[PDB]
Amino acid sequence: DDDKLHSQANLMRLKSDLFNRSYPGPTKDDPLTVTLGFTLQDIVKADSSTNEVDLVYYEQQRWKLNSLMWDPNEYGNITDFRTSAADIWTPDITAYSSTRPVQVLSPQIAVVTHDGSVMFIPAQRLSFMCDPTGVDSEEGATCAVKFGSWVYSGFEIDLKTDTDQVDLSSYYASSKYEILSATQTRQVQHYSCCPEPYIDVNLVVKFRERR
Amino acid sequence: KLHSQANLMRLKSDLFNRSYPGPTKDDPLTVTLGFTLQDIVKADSSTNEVDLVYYEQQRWKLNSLMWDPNEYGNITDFRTSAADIWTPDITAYSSTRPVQVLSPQIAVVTHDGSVMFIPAQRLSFMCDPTGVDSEEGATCAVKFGSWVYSGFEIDLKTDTDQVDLSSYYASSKYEILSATQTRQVQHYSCCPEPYIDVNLVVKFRERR
Amino acid sequence: SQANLMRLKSDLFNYPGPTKDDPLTVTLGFTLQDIVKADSSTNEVDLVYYEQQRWKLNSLMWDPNEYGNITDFRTSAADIWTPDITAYSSTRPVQVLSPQIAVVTHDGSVMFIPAQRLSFMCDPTGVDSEEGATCAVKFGSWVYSGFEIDLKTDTDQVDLSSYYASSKYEILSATQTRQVQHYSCCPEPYIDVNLVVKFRERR
Amino acid sequence: SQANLMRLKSDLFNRMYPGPTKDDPLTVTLGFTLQDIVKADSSTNEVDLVYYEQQRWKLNSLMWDPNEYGNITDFRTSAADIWTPDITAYSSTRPVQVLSPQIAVVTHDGSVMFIPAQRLSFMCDPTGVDSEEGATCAVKFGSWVYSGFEIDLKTDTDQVDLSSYYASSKYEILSATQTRQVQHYSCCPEPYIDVNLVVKFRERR
Amino acid sequence: SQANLMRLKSDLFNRSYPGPTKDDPLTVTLGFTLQDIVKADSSTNEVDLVYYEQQRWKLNSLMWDPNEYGNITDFRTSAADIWTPDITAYSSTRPVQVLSPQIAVVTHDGSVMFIPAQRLSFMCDPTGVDSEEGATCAVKFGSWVYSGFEIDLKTDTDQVDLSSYYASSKYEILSATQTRQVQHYSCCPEPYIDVNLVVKFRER
Ligand SMILES: COc1ccc2cc1Oc1cc3c(cc1OC)CC[N+](C)(C)[C@H]3Cc1ccc(cc1)Oc1c(OC)c(OC)cc3c1[C@@H](C2)[N+](C)(C)CC3
Ligand SMILES: COc1ccc2cc1Oc1cc3c(cc1OC)CC[N+](C)(C)[C@H]3Cc1ccc(cc1)Oc1c(OC)c(OC)cc3c1[C@@H](C2)[N+](C)(C)CC3
Ligand SMILES: COc1ccc2cc1Oc1cc3c(cc1OC)CC[N+](C)(C)[C@H]3Cc1ccc(cc1)Oc1c(OC)c(OC)cc3c1[C@@H](C2)[N+](C)(C)CC3
Ligand SMILES: COc1ccc2cc1Oc1cc3c(cc1OC)CC[N+](C)(C)[C@H]3Cc1ccc(cc1)Oc1c(OC)c(OC)cc3c1[C@@H](C2)[N+](C)(C)CC3
């Protein structure tokens, strides 16, 4: 009950050291790479009257800041902590073809590790632009939606995925829709309009009515 | 009475302007979870969503919240807003829509440092209701647990294997065949932490 | 006189809820305005009503004589404690239709009357018959036991003087009744006001 | 310019009107501009309107003299910055949805103009809408918590402004009026004042 | 450098805009990028449009010398933290739904660029959308509270950007125009400015 009082005291001081003394977001001089991963849980609805499809997925977001690092030794072997997302800067990762505000299904809480890495995994329901024509056929339908920063250019936020394969191991086994394939791919595009690169992660999902 | 009010504000002030940042590997917390199913409102076989109304009883206990009632005018408990205290981030793992909260976000803290919080909710979750119009009915399942704490920081426990059905609405469109809540612990090659959840399985069918 | 009002509000504000030794009695009453919807596919009924709430606090007494003949004021419900009155068989969050503003009287009584839309559990079978349908929903505190909060009605007649004359549904009767319940599981009384409405398709 | 304005506001907002009282009652003028009858639902007896509600009142505690403030005669301010009346429809079926910025104009004479655009669902039986006669519905507007002892209401005209009514609405407008009324109930000594919005309308042809 | 930015932000905000006035009017630039007509409801005559508005204005109190601040030329700030123009649709039938983060980019010249993505329901008779010639609807945008003496609204370009319009929408766009309109009304000596967006569209 004195180890425990002492360990709490260490956590509160770490959080005050990082949060109260000592983040404006990335700049071209100090750019940030966010690692993104999708875990598709369900294609919930495919609306052929409006060409909207609703997905439920988790989005794992990961980045690393020097100003969040600390030494576990000065803070009682604390190697990580949970904190509300409002306590830290988080990337404005946004779907570029959503048709309604994304609905958050999970607690807005992040895990900060001693080397400055942050991991934040919002579960979400998204309506996005998609013609589901062909979903009732063997070859199925294909849709795509890009994710990336809304306001930071490619000189300030970069992105990558650890694999092209969307994680399907939690995909709902009785969904109305069967997944034929689902890929997530970093894409850098150059436009003449603009000297900065446009970076996004493209999520391509091919699916059909479960038979 | 004007005195008991004085003692309540003082207790609160002592507990809340003196010194709890959430559980850690060094200071883990056991959350006891129990479900009371009130209604299955809707089963949608076009999207495989089912809507439940249920109560989620959450209980945990902290040293930082204990007091001696003798020192505070015999006060043995008090109510406080859930924003005022740490609460566990218990979450359904296969919801299809944000849960809608039906009850006041206020908890009851007891002098032994136990907290009870009972959010009533309507939840849409993933569920194929095929067979609901048959004798055998349909079965669905949804896992609840911490979103961000592993089994190293929050352990979950049930007080019973049975979901409380005694308040189930007797004129629901659906009748309950069985409703159980089973703690489960799981490990993955990738990761060293245990993951703990409570699996809510409900078998149900169209009322006769 | 505006002078006088700010000074009273000044004096009074500068109440953390009831306790077992300082309990609170809340008076409830309902003004049924409309049965807007009765969905027989889900057994949900939607009602629009005013939830009349009143309680009295020692804290809020004053002399209309020490303050320019000011017998009452209005204040945002957000500046004051209000009881956590909740339906016990809603299916959706309640939607509030009116400003959240309370009226405090010099006798220390607070009146707060939100108009609200509520979906609750109700089988409307029989609504297209002469006998019509009958549904019930109970209201009461969610987090205060009957040791800290008690309830009462001023009358058992639901106020129907504002019932919408052209609703799809006519009201055959509507009663509001304080209930006290005891259960073996639990050592506090369960107190609530039960609203029972009998109604049928208008003809 | 901005120094004068930032001073004005600091002065007015730092030297708060606690609402009207019986001793100092307030008159609020209301008028409606009806834009559209968006939907009429005959299964639930709910009609939806989109309108602008012009509210206007006048406080002594919001007067200033322009020459002490660089010839400023008016300013725009967030409506959460000032008291605004709790004007409410008495028979809505869904929370009212606000379609415009919650910003008011204060003028040097202490008068305030606030004009929220709103969408409103309200209790209305649309029977007869598919006929030449049309349907008729009414909704009353007034203060939720102030009786006629603290808030009096008025209109400048009892004709609803239809000059902006949408030309290709599903529903044509036959007439629309806004009438101040004073009610006295046996229960209560206070007068209750409202503006009654009555609309007749039919399916456009 | 992370510190140069953390100081620039201090100087501008927590060390000093009550919006525009008749003596200090603001020019605001508006342009539309249309992304999807999602739905046209002929039972209620509403159409739902997903689109972006590019807003741009320049303020003196947002000027700074780059070489006094680490060669920082621009930054990103939350739109809640700066004044932003009250640009509103004059005939929407439901509150706007915001699809993107509400973050503006401020440049050293004091210019501000803000690009909200939104879904907007507005009044629109879709009669004709199932025929070769389509249906035509219009929606005007402008300040709700500031006349043309306080906010002077202009288009950035004369053209609606259709380059990112979703190719597999239920509805094809046959044309879309954006045009600044000035009107004098008899209540008031001030000019009133809006930008009218006119869209002709039909079922794909
Ligand atoms: C200068 O502006 C742009 C440059 C380039 C494009 C759009 C542009 O339009 C805008 C983009 C963006 C914003 C505002 C825009 O206008 C005011 C704000 C937010 N960011 C900066 C993040 C992007 C977000 C963003 C939004 C739309 C977008 C790409 C990025 O559109 C595209 C697609 O996705 C829908 C797509 O997918 C298959 C394929 C293509 C495009 C666009 C790409 N076109 C057609 C040109 C080529 C092919
Ligand atoms: C220990 O728990 C309970 C004990 C007793 C009951 C419910 C219980 O379940 C809960 C009740 C309550 C809470 C949480 C509960 O679970 C953890 C939190 C909020 N309070 C404390 C305020 C009540 C709110 C409340 C909620 C449900 C409720 C009664 C009160 O259900 C009933 C009815 O209304 C739905 C009803 O109507 C005819 C008739 C009856 C009941 C219940 C009463 N049964 C069936 C048992 C007997 C008859
Ligand atoms: C917060 O305060 C109120 C909020 C809302 C209203 C009155 C209010 O004020 C009082 C209510 C009450 C009292 C005193 C009040 O203020 C000193 C004394 C006792 N109770 C607590 C029981 C109610 C009883 C009560 C008294 C008056 C009353 C409604 C209920 O007024 C109305 C009507 O009936 C007269 C009526 O009839 C068709 C229609 C309407 C109203 C009122 C309702 N408006 C205009 C707003 C809407 C339409
Ligand atoms: C003084 O009162 C008004 C005078 C003039 C009009 C509306 C009026 O109603 C109001 C307008 C406005 C407000 C409040 C109003 O009421 C108190 C708040 C602030 N702004 C400045 C934003 C306008 C916003 C505004 C709102 C509606 C509006 C025009 C402007 O309606 C019109 C249109 O479509 C929206 C349209 O295009 C098809 C064409 C026309 C109109 C109107 C213009 N008529 C028919 C008369 C002429 C041509």
What is the spatial distance between Cα D32 and Cα D89, in angstroms, rounded to a whole number?
12
Q: At D114, list the tokens.
A: 């606030």
User: If DSSP codes are grouped into helix, strand and coil, which group holds residue E172?
Assistant: strand
Query: Best of A34, A146, A149 to mutate for ligand 1, by most ligand atoms within 8 A of CB?
Result: A146
The reply to whether residue D24 touches residue C9, judged by beta carbons under 8 angstroms, is no
Exposure of E55 by Cβ count < 10 A (0-12 exposed, 13-18 middle, 19+ buried)? buried
- Two tokens at A46? 């495919």
Helix (H/G/I), strand (E/B), else coil: B28: coil
Atom of ligand 2 nearest to the CA of C185: 1
**Architecture of the domain spanning D1-205:** Distorted Sandwich (2.70)
Is residue D97 packed enough to be buried (19+ CB in 10 Å), middle (13-18) or exposed (0-12)?
Answer: middle
Residue D160 to residue D139: CA distance in whole angstroms: 13
| CATH node for E1-204 | 2.70.170.10
CATH architecture of the domain covering C1-203: Distorted Sandwich (2.70)
Determine the residue of B167, B168, B171, B181 to mutate for testing ligand 2's pocket, defined as the one with the most ligand atoms within 8 A of the Cβ atom. B167
**Cα(C147)–Cα(C149) distance, rounded to whole angstroms?**
6
Please report the sign of the dihedral spanned by the C-alpha atoms of residue B172, residue B174, residue B180, residue B181: negative
Angle at A204 (CA atoms; ends A198, A206), nearest 5 degrees: 165
Intra-chain end-to-end CA distance of chain D, in Å? 54
Identify the bridge partners of residue B124 per DSSP, sorted by sequence position: B51
Ligand 2 centroid, distance to B36 Cα (angstroms) = 9
Kindly state whether A13 is in contact with chain B, defined as any CB-CB distance less than 8 angstroms.
Answer: no
Atom 19 (ligand 1) nearest CA: A150
DSSP chain D: -HHHHHHHHHHHTT-------SSS-EEEEEEEEEEEEEEEETTTTEEEEEEEEEEEEEEEEEE--GGGTTT--EEEEEGGGS----EEESSBSS--EE-S--EEEEETEEEEEE--EEEEEEE---TTTTSSS-EEEEEEEEESS--TTTEEEE-S-SB-B-TT--TT-SEEEEEEEEEEEEE--TT-SS-EEEEEEEEEEEE--
DSSP assignment string, C80-138:
S----EEESSBSS--EE-S--EEEEETEEEEEE--EEEEEEE---TTTTSSS-EEEEEE
When scoring A53, A129, A198 by the number of chain E Cβ atoms within 10 A, the one with the most, hence best to mutate, is A129
What does the alpha-carbon distance between residue B179 and residue B190 come to, in Å, rounded to a whole number? 32
Q: How was this structure determined?
A: X-ray
CA-only gyration radius of chain D, Å: 19
Contact in structure between C105 and C133 (CB atoms under 8 Å): no
* CATH number for the domain running over A1-211: 2.70.170.10
Partners for E (CB, 8 Å, 3+ pairs)? A, D
The Cα–Cα gap between B91 and A149 comes to 27
DSSP state of A28: S
* Range list of β-strands (E), chain A: 32-47, 52-69, 80-84, 93-95, 103-104, 109-113, 115-120, 123-129, 141-149, 157-160, 177-189, 198-209
Chain C residues lying within 8 Å of D145, measured CB to CB: 74, 99, 101-103
Q: Does domain B1-208 have CATH number 1.10.940.10?
A: no
- Tell me how far apart the alpha carbons of residues A56 and A42 are, in angstroms, rounded to a whole number: 5
Token code pair at residue D97: 């949805």
Residue in D6, D36, D103 nearest the CB of E123: D36
Beta-carbon contacts of residue B166 (< 8 Å; ≥ 6 apart): B36
Domain regions of chain E by residue span: 1-204
Query: Would you call E144 and D103 a contact, using CB atoms and an 8 Å cutoff?
Result: yes
Report which secondary-structure segment, H or E, holds A7: helix A3-20
> Which three-class secondary structure state does DSSP give residue A11?
helix
As a whole number of angstroms, the distance between CA A111 and CA A118 comes to: 6
Query: With contact defined as beta carbons under 8 Å apart, do C117 and C94 qualify?
Result: yes
How far off is chain A from B123, nearest CA to CA, in Å? 11
Residue D176: C-alpha distances to residues B29, D54, D96, D197, E169 (Å): 64, 16, 20, 7, 39
* Nearest CB to D98; choose among E23, E44, E95: E95
